[model samples]
Target: GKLLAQEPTCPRDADGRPRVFVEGSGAYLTDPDGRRWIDFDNARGSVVLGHGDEEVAEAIARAARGRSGVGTAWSPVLDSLLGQLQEVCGGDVVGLYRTGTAALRSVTCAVRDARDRSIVLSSGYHGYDPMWHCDEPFTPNQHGIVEFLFDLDVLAEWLSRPEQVAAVVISPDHMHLGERWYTEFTRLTKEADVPVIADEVKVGLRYRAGLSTPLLDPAVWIVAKCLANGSPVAAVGGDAHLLAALEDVSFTSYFEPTAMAAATTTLRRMATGEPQQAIRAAGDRFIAHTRAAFANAGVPIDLAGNGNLFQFVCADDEVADAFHAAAAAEGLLFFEGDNQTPSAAFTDEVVEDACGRIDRVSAALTGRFTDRELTEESWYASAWGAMDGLADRPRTREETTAIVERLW
Candidate 1:
């Protein structure tokens, strides 16, 4: 049944059947019918270097050919990946746990324990297993967690009880509140002597191929996606003092050679900053063109976030439905109702194609929307909206998966 809302922005046929992609190349994925989709989600922003990158693929193939066993043994591959990672994430000690979910689990437990406080406040969604993003006035799933949800006042109140407040977790929204706001967040944490954890799971490499909120200077960084050009790998590390608990965090993938090779090759290419720069340029183009289309068509759609990441806001639910359906029809695949991602592979030609399709989507909805001057939501506004809309109920893994696939 259309894969029941799978990732990579699954599309449905006219009968609500799913179109399965049989191959991927650059920014496009080919369905079983051989139709190509311009995938803006970029594997939920994991395919930083683009889908099926030959160099990274060869790296994986070479490593796979060289080994048949996964017993924990020290190898240059592990060393090289760690060496490349520390500089990118600005972490002194990096642990390869290989998923944002695990990294979140790893860093959350360690940071809380490190600070000797059981209660930690979250700024945004962290991961699946333990949902840390809390709404106001709710019974705690962990009771150890709180949701600051992008409001500084909420943070100030949480820090009021600093003895019990272990830390602050941020997903790093660069554009919404601006860089200076992050400085304030960091200052507040410093004043309270509470640690800040930067959850760069989705925005890690996509934002300049490094730390998204370096202004926060978080004590711990949880990184996932883009490290291996869509292969499986995640890293958790920051100040060594805060991660003493991770010293015993072991897993079978600790020495996974194939994933290691993918990370090494992908990181080496990213070191040049070409992919990061390209994705940023494409992200800028995406918003600019999209806004222009809506403005000319007099559609009441607001946009928020940054060139590295952002989302569309329809004035009405039905308008959003109309817009997304048109978008799917155009084969401009992206995560609906979530962040619309861009990639280094979204070339100038691809953007031209995408913009044309987007223009059509906007045109089809013209006169159906209001002429209200739409403005981008401030970072706090974005957070508050999410808190009100999403926090009303606990988020299921399926729901969260759908959210990210649209925006991813």
Candidate 2:
């Protein structure tokens, strides 16, 4: 029962396991079994204003009164919403859409319109497209049609050969490239005379000083999720003239009144600083507690991303899977795998709880593991020797649990 081999195949409600039934409230939910669980995920990144904010409710209500469909030709609601977004993302023109995916399409259109050339350069992950980030042969997940190059040198060579690059999309923080890549890419794009599009859908508000901070390229187009924290709205912001071309009546995308209203309210709420500060502080606390829990439990974890958002990997895949299961059992559901990253909404309480659960399960399984047991994997070279020669005896169950519980 401890090891299911594959995914769990639970059957029935009461006879099996109770399912989560989010009873109407803010930051609280009730399960079918009557147990209460904290609303931590908050619709996976949406829900910035929390569960039931009165402002969001009022906005949604007004939109509903107006029939909640796409409005034609300058809806006052969208005008106000776009104004708020321009204030946040720091751009001249804001193109509205229903989702980040749609915004990506709009951005791609902008790239195509500006470049007139064919090749598009990018180093980091963007949305669902058969692009470079998804198709590199050596990459662990080769899933698209785009050509791949890890370095700026390769990008330059690629561009030099064809002299045809429409746009280059790169993240501020990606797997191999750090902050420096962004700086260099900006310089390269300028020299090449190709427009650069910064895909800030994920890194927009949380990573930098704020969303409105100007990026490296003045001509660069920035795409941000309008309701990145709530509802579903995306906007593309950039040079007024370039964006004016996109401003054509035919260039418009999806426009749900309710979503636009939600974006406006969420943006207004974000301006207040209470919820945003709470989320930022909470993000820091989560990282700190998660790190402490892993370290205290003796699980070697490699951290990535800035303090606001981060990812960590267990020493090995098997250990990571075990940790995931254990955390779930302890009422802390992790996103799974070594590639799992924390979102901004992941509160201090949730991170500490999850990390504490991970520590408990990891200690139970490997507290007595010898250095020989750890060094079986070749990739553990750096950590292998240190853990292998450890003379300290493993702690008792009570000791391990107490240490983990303290983090929670």
Candidate 3:
């Protein structure tokens, strides 16, 4: 109750209480009452190696007992971590940090400084920072920052404008518009000489090994997260000139040996893989099987996203809400509505268990659960209600056609 009062956006149960879990291991989280749920959320996509990974824990333990003291000062551990990040990101320089927002701020500041321009072109959810807060259907008085719709023509129009753009910030995977736009946007940004800042905080590592936006190369700055197996570490890497500007900014103590060690071990494991390939294979199977099951059940649901990240989009908001509630009742947790992030620990057995629960939910949704009353509202109920209205907003045939044309 106190937590809900403090962090209002924190996910809660149907009864408006926190869903407290006492422990987590591999792909399951155990509630206080001893019920174990297969965690598809994976700590907001941070725990790519899954909960309480042994290797990550061992690395953290070793770092805790190491000689390095926590401070802004540099150390061998920090140096090694930075070097590894550079090698992974293919950047000439790297700056270590503790949060994705901090890394983004650093990247924005450095790019702004490098290009000597104030205008920023942005897309997708980019944290709470005001600089990238503006959304599509551009708003006025946003100071020089302008947002364009996630359409190639819209982006092309913005790029054609004479106003100098300091940087272009985007998360291709999060846009949900498809890969063609990502490829075109990167090409246009590069051709225009505007520094491209790829925000890979959510999709990094989950999509590919070192670099997150592997398809979009030569990014002036790349911000990374989900890189340290749930460790509180974030990184910004790019050309030396742009990253050198990052040094003038204040650094934090949280980028200490523990985070460095965890990231080092995690990156090493990821590079010389077992987990990534296995995770991707599992994700592919999960997606295919889930789609097949839904189709077999004659449910009108759409799955968006690639690799380990995905979400279920129902025909309408009411159906989506009902499905989510039913899934929750069946011990399947999703992140922010139906967004699911599968991790390396989601082996065949774990996914199979989840599939059984999903099948039950689907059956329930088709008949018995259709008119079931949700005694208590989910924490996201109000917000999702608002989103439902937006989802119902009318769009032209041309707009729909344009979107379909851009799909990869």
Candidate 4:
């Protein structure tokens, strides 16, 4: 008997069989038999620098030898890391926190205290914490939380009266909404005087720096993913006073040397901006080619986003399943049916190979079915987003009025 924390997208072979990888190098994972598949998922979007970066590994090796036992002596790493976080995120006081929920709440809670409010409005996955919850589309926010799904009108409605709203949290994890939505949303929140939390943990460096960094200024920025490359690390920045007050409000696992070493090396390397630029360039290239290739093969697949972060939209769940099965045959390893997070290691050549793999995968769907609906007309086919059992909006409209009213 075996149990997995998330029975989500792991390794699956072509015929709906299972696969387990034993090793992973840059841009590829090696199976027991040594088959290296280009890993587009990037460890659920955490390995920003790519798998097993030798420099990162060596740094950790040095740290692991001398930095794990002492607790108070773990101060220098935190100070160094916080400085880098400020450089990347441009915030007053950067905190070395961990994970998404606690680090996120540490900032939001502090803001709520500052504003002396009781409500928080958010969109996208924050984390697996009970504090952020909703029963249904129309149900009142159970824990002083309301989720507005990047709808400008809906967001405006919540911010109209900022009495109960302490802050508005936005995450770019499921990067489906448009640029206009984010830009206007930030404007509205600022105008409302509502502190906005850019929950950039998962989307930290994958998409861009701090979600809508230069476009708007968030009151707080929570960064986790990519900071440590693949190691567990997080940081909260913005409002030096607020972050300083939450000294003991977050998790204690933030100090270990391995995570610190991995993060420090990643920050130093990524600071050059080469890795981020490469990932975007390669990712966009792969996405564009997939569109042309999938079209040529008569596969009715559309994209919800770009290679930086994208979802594969198909006719239905059946087609989605078929696509995954076919994907395995082509050696195209994505985040299962979720967004395909391409890494910096996905060089131009790797993308070319992946594009050919996508061609073959889409080709298998050729002539087998009719398009039930256009992508714009069809609903999103997500295997994990909402169904993964994390807290999210109830997914509705008139219903939203009822809940938003209750939250109000």
TM-score for each predicted model, relative to the true structure: 0.86, 0.72, 0.85, 0.87
Compare candidates 2 and 3 on lDDT and give the better one. Answer: 3
- Runs in model 4 deviating more than 4 A are 1-19, 67-72, 173-175, 208-211, 250-252, 377-408
TM-score of 1: 0.86
- Per residue, candidate 2 scores C-alpha lDDT tens digits across 1-408 of 346554332221323442456463454456666665444444444555556667778878887787554655557777787787777667767777665566666666665665566656654455554443442221223321233333555556655644656666654444234456556666666777776677666556543334523436645444444253467676678776555557653544355677777777776766555565566566566567666655665665544433444454456656655555565555543334312233434566655665565567556645532232243232222221211111122344464334324321
- Per-residue C-alpha lDDT of model 1 across residues 74-167, encoded as one tens digit per residue: 7877777788888877777888886787888778888878788778777666666645544442223455777544656557877877898777
The ten-residue window of minimal lDDT in model 4 covers: 383-392
Which predicted model would earn the best TM-score?
4
RMSD of each: 5.9, 10.4, 5.7, 4.4
Candidates arranged by lDDT, highest first: 1, 4, 3, 2
Tell me the spans in candidate 3 whose CA falls farther than 4 Å from its real position: 1-10, 67-73, 140-143, 252-255, 368-408
Per-model lDDT: 0.72, 0.52, 0.67, 0.71
For model 2 the local lDDT of residue 97 reads 63
Q: Between which residue pairs do clashes occur in model 2? A: 46-229, 47-229, 47-230, 48-229
Query: Candidate 3 overall Cα lDDT vs. reference?
Result: 0.67
Q: For candidate 3, write residues 1-408 as lDDT tens digits.
A: 553445434457867776888899999999888898888777677788889999888878877886554555667777777777777677777777777877787777777777777777765455566665533344322656665544455557677863577777775554244456557777887777777777777766666665555557655545445678888888777778766687776655654788877788787776655677788788777778777877766766656555477777665557676777887888888775635778889998987888888888778766533343322122123222221111112355474344333321
Q: What count of clashes does model 3 give?
A: 0
